[PDB]
Amino acid sequence: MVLLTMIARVADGLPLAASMQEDDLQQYQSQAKQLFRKLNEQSPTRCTLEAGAMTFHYIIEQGVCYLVLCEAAFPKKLAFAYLEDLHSEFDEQHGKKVPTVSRPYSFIEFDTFIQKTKKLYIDSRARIMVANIEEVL
Amino acid sequence: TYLEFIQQNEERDGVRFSWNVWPSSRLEATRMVVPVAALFTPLKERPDLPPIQYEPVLCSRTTCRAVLNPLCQVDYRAKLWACNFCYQRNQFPPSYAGISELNQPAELLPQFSSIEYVVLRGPQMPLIFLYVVDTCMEDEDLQALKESMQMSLSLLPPTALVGLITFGRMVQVHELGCEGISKSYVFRGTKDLSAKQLQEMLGPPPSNRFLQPVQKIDMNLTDLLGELQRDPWPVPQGKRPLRSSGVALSIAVGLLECTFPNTGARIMMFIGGPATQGPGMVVGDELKTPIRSWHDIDKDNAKYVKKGTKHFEALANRAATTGHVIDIYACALDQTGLLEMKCCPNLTGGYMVMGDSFNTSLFKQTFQRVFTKDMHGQFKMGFGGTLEIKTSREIKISGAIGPCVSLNSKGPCVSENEIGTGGTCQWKICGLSPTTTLAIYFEVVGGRGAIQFVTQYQHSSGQRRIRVTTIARNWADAQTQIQNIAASFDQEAAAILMARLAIYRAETEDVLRWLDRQLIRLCQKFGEYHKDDPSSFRFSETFSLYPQFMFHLRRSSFLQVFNNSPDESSYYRHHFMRQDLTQSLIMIQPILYAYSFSGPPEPVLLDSSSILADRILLMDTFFQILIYHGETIAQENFRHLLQAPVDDAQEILHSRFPMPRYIDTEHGGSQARFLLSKVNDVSLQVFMDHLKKLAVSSA
Amino acid sequence: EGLRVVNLLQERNMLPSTPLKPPVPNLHEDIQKLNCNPELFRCTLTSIPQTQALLNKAKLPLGLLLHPFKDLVQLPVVTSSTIVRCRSCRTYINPFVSFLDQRRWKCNLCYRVNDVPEEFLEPHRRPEVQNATIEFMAPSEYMLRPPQPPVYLFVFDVSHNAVETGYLNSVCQSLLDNLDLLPGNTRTKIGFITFDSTIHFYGLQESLSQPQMLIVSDIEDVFIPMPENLLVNLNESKELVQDLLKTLPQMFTKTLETQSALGPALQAAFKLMSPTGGRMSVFQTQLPTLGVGALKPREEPNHRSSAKMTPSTDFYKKLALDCSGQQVAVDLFLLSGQYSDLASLGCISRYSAGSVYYYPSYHHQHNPVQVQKLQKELQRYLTRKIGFEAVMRIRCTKGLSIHTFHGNFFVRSTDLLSLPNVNPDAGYAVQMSVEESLTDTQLVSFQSALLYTSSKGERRIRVHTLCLPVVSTLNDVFLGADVQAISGLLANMAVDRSMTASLSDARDALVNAVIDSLSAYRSSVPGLMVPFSLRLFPLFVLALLKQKSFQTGTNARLDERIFAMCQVKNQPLVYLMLTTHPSLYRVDNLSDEGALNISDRTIPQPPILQLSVEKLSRDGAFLMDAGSVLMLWVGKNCTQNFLSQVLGVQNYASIPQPMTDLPELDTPESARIIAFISWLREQRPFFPILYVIADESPMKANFLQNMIEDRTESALSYYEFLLHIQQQVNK
Ligand SMILES: O=C(O)CCCc1ccccc1
Ligand SMILES: [Zn+2]
Ligand SMILES: [Zn+2]
């Protein structure tokens, strides 16, 4: 029921936009980048990975992977609706520049929309495939 | 007429006794079945008594100091009077030098057996209102709550001081009218604070930065109340909001305790759910675990109750000792924690309002009834009431049952056998109204026994006032003891006073076993029967309704707690321990009226046989007003019948303070269950038959 | 030029009339023409001793002084898909590498040969090899997290004393004027905290009619009261932060709060920034006396008290380390009129790569100097560029070892400097020693590199590389000595000797630095003979001993001395020289020998005078460039043309007592002196205020406290200093 959002270009795993808040992040941010590395043109376009007390959820559109991590208790139904809201906005704004950039995090300013959209999902008042993550790695 | 006597005495003195004739012997005082007790209403309204602006005149005897009353022997020639309690002869004060027999003091006329004095010596303190508002609730509930408090603000006296404390996960003590900011002091709702700590952490008519006159602050508070928003902290999935009610109250208590102790103040708490964090926690934040029930508490599956009840219990004693009132207004679909918080409005004079949502006409109307004004525009509420009772040397006081706190004042009128809040001749009542009814239980250790009720309280005008009710009842004639005693029995008042004793023992734990051994003992001592012949048993017209009252009491929701939530059980007993006689009777035995073409509306028995198919019923439980349509009527003459009970309902809907819940149901409707459960061991027929079998056999 | 020996006892005016210039390393023409700009990176000994035994003989300190984030006129920004770094020591590909196979290059720091990648393609024409100063784009592996946003948290003291100084009115005015100029993109966050006995947060929401002042009173157990709108988006909430800045000074006029809970407030300001990090601007005006981190009062010394510094608590040091681990840097604005234990408060800025700013006896009415000083120093503070969550590594060629670091940072792993912020006005220093004899090499290189997150959200690496020759002759070491750089490194070394030992031992080690080196020089060749490169060495050490950091017989107070030591540790070498030995010019008679090339401006170039009253003249006027201020002393018998045509006054008596700046009059005499002053302040970003207040009787003649060559009742003159050195050189 917490946060971790990464938007990367699937070809190289180039980070495009992310968002993290703590007050550890070091381990699951590693597995996130191990995943972006393995992802290729044959990977499932939608998936869910089990990481013990945590659980990854990602979709893929236009060669862009939208990854999210949370505690396994978080409704998987909501996680993909969260990634869908990110993609449609991100694709609408930066979909045509993704295959041209070469800097890491060339869309840091997408930080804004990530966190204002994130809050609409981590508050109950506001209102595919499964595989253990240790395998794919 | 013994009924004319009981009527007029309650109309004049606001009191009703179990027995109007008292045992003149030691052998009859010990063998009293229903104890000598009184249903006393210290502030009862009546036909415009003259407020006495002069000093009361008290007896000149250190231990006695009773108030001049109609039972005092006067001597207008010598300008003397003898105190009827201690026989002490007194001299009249200088203001009474012009005293004459053709122009006498009001306090001596038997019409003014109950009278009110006003003491105008010190400057009058302002009233203090402290809104303690929860923010963990839906927007429609919060916006409705915001609208309710803005309306109550527009009715407060301009001199009255106001404070605002909002809370959710944190507790916020607002500093009002700060200009360009509107700051607030934020505290963790996780650890408790004393009055002293809070005073350190925080800092011509008086006031504070936190408590300010309405006339100078109302415009800023009505804008703050309109800008209040829900607790900004998020609620994760499957979780309850972090709601720190236990600390928010202890901060409202400590705030007033260190700023205006010993003065009329109203801590009005508005709850939208249970306390999920800190001391005084009701339930954890896991939605998976439901709030406790009567089943859970009996099977030792409610780990928060005792620890939670104990927290608000000390808060109640703090605010009661300091002399402050704690109201609690709860409106949520789940439970709220009234079972653990009941001590605060019970030990003070605080109100306890319950509902499903602040966005109902049920709450909105009930809330504005709190601020009902009389013929002068002043609230029908008093503060800091001190009740002292003077008795003859033959009468001791076992104690009281009702909204009061013992001042632990010792004196010869204190009885060894203490009952309820006993062991004292003085009781503090932080809040009271014209309705507040105490239950005083006496014990006896020619003619006339005497009791005096002195109630000094802070009026809604700020004036210090003293109410003095002096009553007298004949001693039983020796050659006609039990015969005179039986003739004075008030079966209604005794049923409520015996119900008071039972609920008090249940709420402080069998109880039905005691309630039966006294109904049986009353049947044998005052009934008519041949031994071992149950068919022979009759009761006088004085005692005939007492068993039926006991039948509906022993099966009421006040003693059969299951099939109710603990918040509902504590809410039902709360209002019963405060109401007068007539409303208490309605709680135990709801009234039932019938409506049909065949005659005007008529009362009918609370039995299943009263439910006809071609008849509309009106049931009046104090807590709910129900209208039922028999199977036939469930479809200009049909209009009169269909709205005849509606017109009758609207009237009593308004006067009753805790606005009762209205129900429109019919045959087969789900809401018809409330009618079928109050109606009917088993039934009254079997109950009476088993009662007569034990009455006519051994004692 | 000059291999010549100088008899300091006979010369006496050895200070040149033109500005000192940094020495040129004895390097080949083609290697030197690519060497690092000496403003950004320089060494005390431009001729590195080949062995430690040779370094010990010269009795001179070997070390580096760097200004790595300095504003540049032109920066090569390489966006290379691959950053070429030596596979062993990770040194970046620098101009001083050794290309041999045209596809393999030798590292100039650890001598390992590396394969040039099939990207770098003539590989020697690559920009990474044609520039000693260059900025890279760091790839995804050089960042532990996404680029942190620019976060600015301003923590204001609002106690009774703080409200009396009136600083809050100008600070809020500066922020209003410089709101759009704060470095950052649309990801910029800004926050505000005021504190006295309690800690006051300020929530800002578009839904509410006005901000809200959330007060946490539990000083022993602080917390964040609201989760969302304490650090707000400056772009979205521009109007909300503007009303708060216009309202904040007015909220505390009638305050009776006499105490300050700085410790708890810093802890609260830390928790608010710990999630993201950023720059924490703390504005304190008095001794912290309430809560955790409380400091006891101290009695100020007098001229009579001898040399008998350290912090009184480690609270602000521990707290600074916690801020460093969260990429939080704390800048300390101290505007106190009384003692405030800056020796302890300074730890919050030293160990977190912050900078401390000191304004003694600040008052909005009583002290118009500190008012305009703060105004201009804040103008630079809020508008200068900034890098976030930074680290810095200082690399030097094998055999040389760095063993001591100087500056504001946290040192993690030897050669790993933590910079929660990096600012373009910070200076750093390093002390090295010859761990292994440089018999193999004749060149050694030095590399520093700055990994930081830009204000636009881009990981960048600014790299500087310096190459120097190796020598094995005592005279060769002396011929390459940098007298200014040695003065800077010795100042940093003496600050540590003060804390470590005392001000006496710090002053002795400074005096022994001149005695031991020149005694070693004499033993390798009647009067006092020094090499040409060390002819200003006793003069600059003397000025060091009369500076407010190390002076003794003066009436100086505790926080004055501590701040002077903080400026030694944190400022670039140029500002240490301009302060310790200010430049003195005569200005009442400027002419045309100037730099009249600049299109339409002439800009006189008057000669530099030495710091002695004997160079003054009651008939003229004298400007003194102290780096941060420009004091214009006027003579009692000054000319009449100067008064009416430059000062705009008809006589010396009606020169206003505090004069904040010169007038711009329609006179060519004014056009000259305004041209010289305006040219002096263009040589620096920190706008220096110029107060003519130095009259011959304004009671503000601290102008004369910089005449370091003259004698006073408790210090030697310059000639007395040479006399003392010579008795020790040939004892
Ligand atoms: O461990 C390291 O040195 C590589 C990371 C730190 C750094 C980055 C860039 C430049 C210098 C240093
Ligand atoms: Zn008496
Ligand atoms: Zn190398």
XYZ file of C-alpha atoms and ligand atoms in Angstrom, chain C residues 85 92 142 391 393 395 449 451 461, ligand 1:
21
model
C 37.781 6.253 -17.207
C 38.827 10.448 -16.297
C 26.297 7.407 -11.251
C 30.319 14.048 -3.917
C 37.040 12.944 -5.318
C 42.963 12.115 -7.311
C 35.755 15.717 -10.189
C 29.378 14.451 -9.395
C 30.409 15.594 -13.594
O 33.687 6.189 -6.730
C 33.800 7.119 -7.570
O 34.792 7.893 -7.521
C 32.729 7.312 -8.639
C 31.514 8.041 -8.072
C 31.918 9.374 -7.448
C 32.503 10.318 -8.495
C 31.746 10.641 -9.607
C 32.252 11.496 -10.568
C 33.524 12.017 -10.416
C 34.287 11.693 -9.306
C 33.776 10.840 -8.343
